[PDB]
Amino acid sequence: EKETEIKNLNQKNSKDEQAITDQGLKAKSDISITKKKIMQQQQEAQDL
Amino acid sequence: KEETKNKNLEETNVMKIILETKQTKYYTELEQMNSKFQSDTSNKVKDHQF
Amino acid sequence: KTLYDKARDRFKESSKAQVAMEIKNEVMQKLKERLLSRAEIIQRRLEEQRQVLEQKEAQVAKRQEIDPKQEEEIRDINFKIDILEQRALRFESMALQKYEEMDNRLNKDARLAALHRK
Amino acid sequence: VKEHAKTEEEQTKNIEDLRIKGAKHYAELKITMETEIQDLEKCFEDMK
Amino acid sequence: ITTENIILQQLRQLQLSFKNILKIQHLQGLERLEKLQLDNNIIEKIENIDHLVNLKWLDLSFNCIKKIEGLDKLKELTDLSLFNNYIEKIEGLHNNTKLNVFSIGNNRLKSYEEITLYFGYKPRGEEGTNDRPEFKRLQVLNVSGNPFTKDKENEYKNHIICAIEGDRQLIRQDEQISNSYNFTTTDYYQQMQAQEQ
Amino acid sequence: KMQVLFKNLEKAEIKKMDRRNDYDTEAQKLEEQKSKLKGTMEDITSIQET
């Protein structure tokens, strides 16, 4: 029971750890809004 | 950190995009006339053996 | 706004239906995740205990002398396998129990009360 | 005081070797492709 | 604009590559030559340029040249190149200790220690009076293409750097050849500073 | 580990100066390209009068 609760809790530990880590890289969401404006400006420059 | 590596890797990418297509264009002629030879004289040589 | 002001104001402030379906489903899915994950943990432990038993029995067979210590460790591994299986069954039991319990508890929530309206 | 002093010093030093490595990467790949270009001629006149 | 009276003796930069020159002459009045370019030809001897002490950026490389000379009085030599030639020693440059930049590549050398001798570094077991570095400011150092430089690569880089361009620190990062020397480059800096003072 | 991974999200979301620096360079090139139209307009007008 000791080791089984340990395994359960540790698997929860890793699950939440990576479930948090993946979101942080999705700050590339704001980065991608910035790069959306990047592509808009790049398109507009060649227009003129 | 990423800013500094951005300039280095972007210079690398630009030089790549520019110069690599050079290597793409160069060689199209050498194979043409060589393969043309490899067929043309086959009959001459075969008669040269017969 | 001075730091003294900050401290004093901190002191003063210290002195001073459709959504419910989604909430229910979210709670049920997380509870099922927890209960299942524990179930596969117990199951995987069954497999690991069986693996240890198989290796120990193979070692005992290789050692023509049937080691009492090796057999004692083999029986320890067997008892571990059996107790892990018992916990796996019991855990399936109270895990379905927990799933039903949490669904029932979410169903009657006041903020989720709009659910029973349909 | 010392925290930020040595923080900025270390930050500048970090930017130093990063630029070293990246710039030499760029220059050496440029050299490689330049050699490719400079050797990508010939073999045609001799054969013909 | 080719000013008709471009003085025969107003020369600082000379470049006579691919003419296949063999000897140096008529340089009187060209002693003000600071940047000399005479590589990629049949030249084999360094002469009639030594009196051109103004020569800092000198290249006589990739030739039939076989020796380093005349630069003793061309101490002002800064960027010295004798690449792809038949030189087998760093000689006459003891009076070129001003040379920060040296290339002896694709020559017929056998060891790098000639350059490190210019830094107060000498091999163990040799009695020498050069306890003071010669190429104190020699940080540009290439020997690529030489017989030994093709021999078990990065050895000369490591030893020369520890006894002497971020490649220099990247090579000081070498652990074992670093142990092969004890007079570190920072110690070299402090010795230079104290000696200057 | 939960808090270590949680905190990384906020700074990444708030600060993206690497990509905004790429954006700044691209905007610099955009503005460099744009005014050439007005310059060519002026030259064209002068040449048209002549």
UniProtKB/TrEMBL annotation, chain B:
Q: Which residues form the signal peptide?
A: none
Q: Tell me the domain of life.
A: Eukaryota
Subcellular location(s) per record: Cytoplasm, Cytoskeleton, Flagellum axoneme; Cytoplasm, Cytoskeleton, Flagellum basal body
Record function comment: Component of the nexin-dynein regulatory complex (N-DRC), a key regulator of ciliary/flagellar motility which maintains the alignment and integrity of the distal axoneme and regulates microtubule sliding in motile axonemes. Plays a critical role in the assembly of N-DRC and also stabilizes the assembly of multiple inner dynein arms and radial spokes. Coassembles with DRC1 to form a central scaffold needed for assembly of the N-DRC and its attachment to the outer doublet microtubules.
- State the family it belongs to: Belongs to the DRC2 family.
Indicate what this protein is called per its UniProt record.
Answer: Dynein regulatory complex subunit 2
Full-length numbering of the shown residues: 204 to 253 of 506
TrEMBL record, chain C:
Which domain of life does the UniProt lineage start with? Eukaryota
Give the subcellular location.
Cytoplasm, Cytoskeleton, Flagellum axoneme
Q: Which residues form a coiled coil?
A: 32-66
Residue ranges constituting the Dynein regulatory complex subunit 7 C-terminal domain according to the UniProt record: 17-115
The UniProt family comment states: Belongs to the DRC7 family.
Q: This protein is called what?
A: Dynein regulatory complex subunit 7
User: What organism is listed for this UniProt entry?
Assistant: Tetrahymena thermophila (strain SB210)
UniProtKB/TrEMBL annotation, chain D:
**Top-level taxon in the UniProt lineage:** Eukaryota
Write the protein's name: Dynein regulatory complex protein 1/2 N-terminal domain-containing protein
Organism per entry: Tetrahymena thermophila (strain SB210)
The range of the complete sequence contained here reads 196 to 243 of 826
UniProtKB/TrEMBL annotation, chain E:
Look up the domain of life of the source. Eukaryota
Question: Where does it live in the cell?
Answer: Cytoplasm, Cytoskeleton, Flagellum axoneme
Family per record:
Belongs to the DRC3 family.
The name of this protein is Dynein regulatory complex subunit 3
What is the organism field in this record?
A: Tetrahymena thermophila (strain SB210)
State the taxonomy lineage: Eukaryota, Sar, Alveolata, Ciliophora, Intramacronucleata
